[PDB]
Design an enzyme around this catalytic site. Structure first.
Site, short mmCIF file in Angstrom:
data_model
loop_
_atom_site.label_atom_id
_atom_site.label_comp_id
_atom_site.label_asym_id
_atom_site.label_seq_id
_atom_site.Cartn_x
_atom_site.Cartn_y
_atom_site.Cartn_z
N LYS A 13 7.36 -1.14 5.77
CA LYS A 13 6.52 -1.54 4.58
C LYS A 13 4.94 -1.74 5.10
CE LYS A 13 8.50 -4.28 1.20
NZ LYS A 13 9.29 -5.62 0.74
N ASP A 27 3.62 15.37 12.04
CA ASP A 27 3.78 14.91 10.52
C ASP A 27 2.12 14.51 10.11
OD1 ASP A 27 5.06 13.72 7.90
OD2 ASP A 27 4.60 11.87 8.75
N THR A 39 6.83 6.04 7.59
CA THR A 39 8.07 6.45 8.35
C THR A 39 9.11 5.44 8.59
OG1 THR A 39 6.69 8.04 9.47
CG2 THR A 39 8.82 7.99 10.29
N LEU A 41 0.58 -1.18 0.07
CA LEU A 41 0.03 0.08 0.17
C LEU A 41 0.81 1.27 -0.04
CD1 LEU A 41 -2.11 -1.45 2.76
CD2 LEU A 41 -3.14 -0.92 0.62
O1 LIG Z 1 2.70 -9.25 -1.16
C1 LIG Z 1 3.79 -9.55 -1.76
C2 LIG Z 1 4.49 -10.81 -1.04
C3 LIG Z 1 5.26 -10.45 0.28
C4 LIG Z 1 5.05 -10.31 1.44
C5 LIG Z 1 5.81 -9.90 2.39
C6 LIG Z 1 7.18 -9.52 2.11
C7 LIG Z 1 8.06 -9.21 3.02
C8 LIG Z 1 9.06 -8.26 2.96
C9 LIG Z 1 9.74 -7.75 3.90
N1 LIG Z 1 10.77 -6.76 4.12
C10 LIG Z 1 11.37 -6.69 5.28
O2 LIG Z 1 12.34 -5.98 5.73
C11 LIG Z 1 12.71 -4.84 4.76
C12 LIG Z 1 13.99 -4.06 5.40
O3 LIG Z 1 13.37 -3.26 6.48
C13 LIG Z 1 12.28 -2.71 5.77
C14 LIG Z 1 11.77 -3.37 4.74
O4 LIG Z 1 10.45 -4.10 5.41
C15 LIG Z 1 10.16 -3.63 6.57
C16 LIG Z 1 11.13 -2.26 6.78
O5 LIG Z 1 11.59 -1.99 8.03
N2 LIG Z 1 10.86 -7.72 6.08
C17 LIG Z 1 10.04 -8.27 5.20
C18 LIG Z 1 9.12 -9.45 5.42
C19 LIG Z 1 8.21 -9.87 4.49
CL1 LIG Z 1 7.21 -10.84 4.74
C20 LIG Z 1 7.49 -9.69 0.74
C21 LIG Z 1 6.83 -9.99 -0.14
C22 LIG Z 1 3.80 -12.05 -1.14
C23 LIG Z 1 4.93 -12.17 -2.04
#
Ligand SMILES: OCC1(c2ccc(-c3cc4nc(O[C@@H]5CO[C@H]6[C@@H]5OC[C@H]6O)[nH]c4cc3Cl)cc2)CC1
Ligand SMILES: Nc1ncnc2c1ncn2[C@@H]1O[C@H](COP(=O)(O)OP(=O)(O)O)[C@@H](O)[C@H]1O
Ligand SMILES: Nc1ncnc2c1ncn2[C@@H]1O[C@H](COP(=O)(O)O)[C@@H](O)[C@H]1O
Ligand SMILES: Nc1ncnc2c1ncn2[C@@H]1O[C@H](COP(=O)(O)O)[C@@H](O)[C@H]1O
Ligand SMILES: [Cl-]
Ligand SMILES: [Cl-]
Ligand SMILES: [Cl-]
Lengths: 159, 289, 369
Positions: free
Chosen positions: C21, C131, C18, C14
């Site tokens: 994701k 903000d 800040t 979406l």
């Molecule tokens: O809907 C698409 C789909 C999908 C769902 C979820 C994730 C996912 C992404 C993440 N990115 C992460 O960290 C990075 C680093 O830190 C940053 C940033 O995100 C949080 C922020 O603090 N942790 C994550 C965990 C998950 Cl489960 C990926 C794809 C199913 C395939």
């Protein structure tokens, strides 16, 4: 079991996760961008996993590894008890990690200038206010809060 | 008693106002400066802090002024040295030669009313034990005001319907009074030997003309006139209508009267407007506890 | 082949707030939709937001207002932290005002009431969401305002001011862009003021590509009021967009305004010269040197946090209870400075408040003006 996250950061056409938890069966990871994920539930304890990134067997170098007695390099994961409750996890994470300011005008606003006084702004509570030493006696004051009520104490003390 | 159960339940904190002012004197502060600070701050009682003892040792009230003023008045031609140059500690050491009473905000309004009568005091300091800080000074007038807010909304019992003579509440014998001619020094004499809040002022005949209170004594400090106590009670009252009750007036009606004009005590006057008795806020809260 | 958290299938991102994701979530069986705020533990501990996130969760879990996005549940994993929240279909109020124009007086007012109500709920719970912009105001199916992203928000503590110069420059207060100290609620009022403008005009009151003239216009509290704007609201905006925080409208003053109160729904709202410290005129370093020389000449253990902020503690000789207080030097003028004495609430004894006075009275009877 507790939800554990498996994320392959890097590009790929086909990306699978083989692991101790699923008897090393190739589990496809769904990709968002350059992140291919799977959220699987694992019991509290040690687990070994590897990745099958586009015809090549790999491990996440950024993650803890283990080399076998046979020279098998797989990734490891100790899924800890403290990882499941948010406030325990954020507590364990907390442990793992000029010129003088311009006087705020809020402080110059008082409640003092019968016993009943106006409700004060939270910012002036606990601050010391004093009256000029007239006839060798200083007058001190401060407004403190007790529960939802406030008291402005005046001390008459000779100096 | 249904009113006594209301008190034994309600926390002292509830009676504390939204935003209060509290004047605390160090025991080392010169006693005259103390009485003037009471007058300037518009407060009738002040907790006293012994810095050496690191605790609240007591209260300073108008009675302290009445006591110094009478113990030490020589004449109107010579200064009350002791009142002028003496610390609160120097005078307290004299007066109290031959302890501190306080209620916690967690204590019930009944405990507070009991503590007031039990020790025969009008000013009770509400002190939080955790902090040790004095929060507010609980008075009879305030408790009586709160009990009146509920007495009105809640039903009227048998006692409330009954008269002041029938219910028999207050002091009607050995009534200490001053006269028109009586000087302030003599009135202060009475306040000491009798230990009563106000003295009804009486004419040539035993009829009540005015009422000289421990409060009107605060005015001597206000006008800086305490050096001339030879003045009559009436002359002293010229700086500022009298309120009296009848023996056949209802207890609930008189309870509304004392609270409506916000007075400390009502005088029981007979058909020919002569003093027959007295009824104080203190007695009313006792009768109700 | 579905990626689930809780029982929701994670979907499209979406946006990116800040700190994390934010992705949609559709319940496996019911089809219910949520907004899932993902926060990498490794990433949050990389910045020093670990404490900020703890408080954010703490607050959002104890809130329940119709115009503040609800935090349903927080799911911890070894990897990341998942914040399951209420999803609104309408999206950004910002995008609304882009696609469609400005809102009609009646419609604008409705939304302004809703927003402010929420802004008030926060403040009524000692939280100041800084903000605050139409980009952070979301809309639901039935066009209700929903305050979102408490990433930059902060707590209000008795006796303390905030420093953080957070939020977009357009919606930021002059004192915030000036990086001065502030109480908290006042900067949300300034933000709520530009939201009301955006609602009635479809543009920003303070805007320019020439950032210097953007900040000049913000600090000069000067904006354009179009001829279509109703004087009653121009009145409200003038009182809301005051450069002086002391001359600025309160949620109390706004609730009292004629334009606000109009058609305002029921559910939305409930219901002798003293001196601050001593003022030395000497060199700021020399003045703090004197308080150190004095804090020592009084034999009291301290802690130097800033070169102008001290956290001093003195042992009680009688009670033997350690009592704490804080000293801060503030610039009043170009020629004069002030030393502020603040009480530090600890954790039977004597009296905290009186002890604090006697503590101060000593460091004063040996100090300048
Ligand atoms: O809907 C698409 C789909 C999908 C769902 C979820 C994730 C996912 C992404 C993440 N990115 C992460 O960290 C990075 C680093 O830190 C940053 C940033 O995100 C949080 C922020 O603090 N942790 C994550 C965990 C998950 Cl489960 C990926 C794809 C199913 C395939
Ligand atoms: N709680 C208290 N602890 C100790 N001394 C007290 C307390 N309250 C009053 N006193 C003392 O009792 C005396 C009479 O006081 P009081 O009846 O309360 O006067 P007032 O009617 O003006 O309130 C004074 O000398 C005062 O110091
Ligand atoms: N002038 C008075 N003479 C005798 N008793 C009095 C007088 N005034 C009050 N009392 C009584 O003194 C007690 C304490 O009263 P007070 O100091 O008015 O709170 C009560 O029992 C009163 O009825
Ligand atoms: N019965 C009374 N009728 C009229 N005024 C009274 C009466 N009793 C006390 N006062 C006045 O109330 C003040 C005394 O205050 P206090 O001791 O606080 O009740 C003085 O100004 C008195 O003249
Ligand atoms: Cl975004
Ligand atoms: Cl919706
Ligand atoms: Cl816009």
């Amino acid at each position: 079991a507790r939800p554990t996250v498996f994320r392959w950061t890097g590009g790929g056409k086909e990306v699978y996760l083989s692991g101790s938890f699923n008897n090393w069966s190739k589990l496809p990871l769904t990709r968002d961008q350059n992140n291919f994920v799977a959220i699987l539930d694992l019991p509290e304890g040690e687990h070994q996993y590897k990745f099958f990134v586009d015809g090549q067997w790999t491990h996440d170098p950024s993650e803890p590894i283990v080399t076998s007695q046979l020279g098998t390099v797989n990734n490891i994961i100790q899924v800890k008890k403290t990882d499941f409750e948010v406030f325990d996890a954020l507590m364990v994470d907390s442990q793992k990690c000029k010129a003088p300011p311009i006087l705020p005008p809020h402080l110059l606003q008082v409640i003092l200038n019968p016993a009943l006084l106006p409700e004060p702004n939270h910012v002036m509570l606990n601050h010391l206010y004093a009256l000029s030493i007239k006839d060798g006696v200083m007058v001190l004051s401060a407004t403190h809060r007790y529960k939802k009520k406030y008291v402005t104490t005046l001390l008459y003390k000779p100096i | 008693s249904v009113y006594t159960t209301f008190m034994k339940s309600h926390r002292c904190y509830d009676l504390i106002p939204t935003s209060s002012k509290l004047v605390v004197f160090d025991t080392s502060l010169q006693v005259k400066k103390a009485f003037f600070a009471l007058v300037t701050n518009g407060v009738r009682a002040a907790p006293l802090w012994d810095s050496k003892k690191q605790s609240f040792v007591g209260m300073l009230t108008i009675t302290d002024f009445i006591n110094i003023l009478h113990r030490y008045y020589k004449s109107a031609l010579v200064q009350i040295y002791e009142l002028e140059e003496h610390k609160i500690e120097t005078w307290r050491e004299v007066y109290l030669q031959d302890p501190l009473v306080c209620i916690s905000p967690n204590a019930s309004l009944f405990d507070a009313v009991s503590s007031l009568i039990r020790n025969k005091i009008h000013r009770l300091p509400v002190i939080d034990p955790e902090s040790g800080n004095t929060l507010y000074i609980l008075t009879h007038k305030r408790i009586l005001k709160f009990l009146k807010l509920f007495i009105t909304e809640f039903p009227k019992p048998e006692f409330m319907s009954k008269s002041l003579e029938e219910l028999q509440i207050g002091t009607y014998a050995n009534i200490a009074m001053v006269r028109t001619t009586t000087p302030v020094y003599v009135a202060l004499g009475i306040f000491v030997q009798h230990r009563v809040s106000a003295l009804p002022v009486v004419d040539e005949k035993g009829r009540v003309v005015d009422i000289y209170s421990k409060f009107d004594v605060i005015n001597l400090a206000a006008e800086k006139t305490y050096n001339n106590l030879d003045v009559s009670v009436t002359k002293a009252l010229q700086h500022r209508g009298v309120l009296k009750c009848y023996l056949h007036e209802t207890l609930e009606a008189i309870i509304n009267r004392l609270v409506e004009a916000e007075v400390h005590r009502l005088v029981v006057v007979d058909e020919h407007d002569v003093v027959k008795g007295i009824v104080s806020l203190s007695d009313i809260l006792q009768a109700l506890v | 082949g579905r990626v689930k958290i809780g029982h929701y299938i994670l979907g499209d991102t979406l946006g990116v707030g800040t700190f994390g994701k934010v992705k949609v979530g559709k319940h496996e069986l019911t089809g219910h939709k949520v907004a899932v705020k993902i926060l990498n533990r490794q990433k949050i501990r990389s910045l020093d937001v670990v404490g900020k996130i703890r408080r954010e969760i703490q607050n959002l879990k104890l809130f329940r207002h119709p115009h503040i996005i609800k935090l349903y549940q927080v799911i911890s994993t070894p990897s990341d932290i998942f914040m399951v929240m209420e999803y609104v279909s309408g999206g950004e109020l910002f995008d609304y005002i882009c696609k469609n124009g400005r809102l009609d007086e009646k419609e604008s007012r409705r939304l302004f009431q809703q927003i402010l109500s929420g802004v008030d709920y926060c403040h009524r719970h000692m939280v100041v969401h800084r903000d605050l912009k139409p980009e952070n105001v979301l809309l639901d199916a039935h066009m209700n305002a929903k305050i979102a992203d408490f990433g930059l928000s902060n707590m209000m503590s008795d006796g303390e001011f905030l420093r953080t110069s957070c939020g977009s420059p357009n919606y930021a207060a002059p004192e915030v862009i000036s990086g001065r100290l502030y109480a908290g609620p006042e900067v949300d009022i300034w933000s709520s003021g530009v939201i009301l403008y955006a609602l009635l005009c479809g543009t920003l009151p303070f805007d320019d590509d020439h950032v210097p003239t953007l900040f000049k216009k913000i600090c000069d509290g000067i904006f354009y009021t179009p001829q279509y704007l109703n004087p009653s609201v121009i009145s409200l905006l003038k009182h809301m967009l005051q450069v002086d925080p002391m001359k600025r409208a309160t949620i109390k003053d706004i609730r009292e305004h004629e334009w606000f109160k109009q058609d305002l729904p029921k559910y939305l709202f409930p219901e002798a010269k003293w001196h601050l410290g001593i003022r030395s005129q000497s060199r700021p370093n020399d003045i703090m040197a004197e308080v150190c020389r004095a804090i020592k000449q009084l034999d009291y253990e301290w802690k130097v946090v800033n070169p102008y902020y001290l956290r001093v503690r003195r042992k009680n000789p009688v009670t033997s209870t350690f009592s704490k207080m804080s000293l801060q030097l503030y610039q009043v003028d170009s020629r004069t400075y002030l030393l502020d004495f603040r009480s530090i609430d600890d954790e039977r004894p004597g009296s905290h408040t009186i002890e604090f006075f006697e503590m101060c009275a000593n460091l004063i009877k040996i100090l300048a003006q």
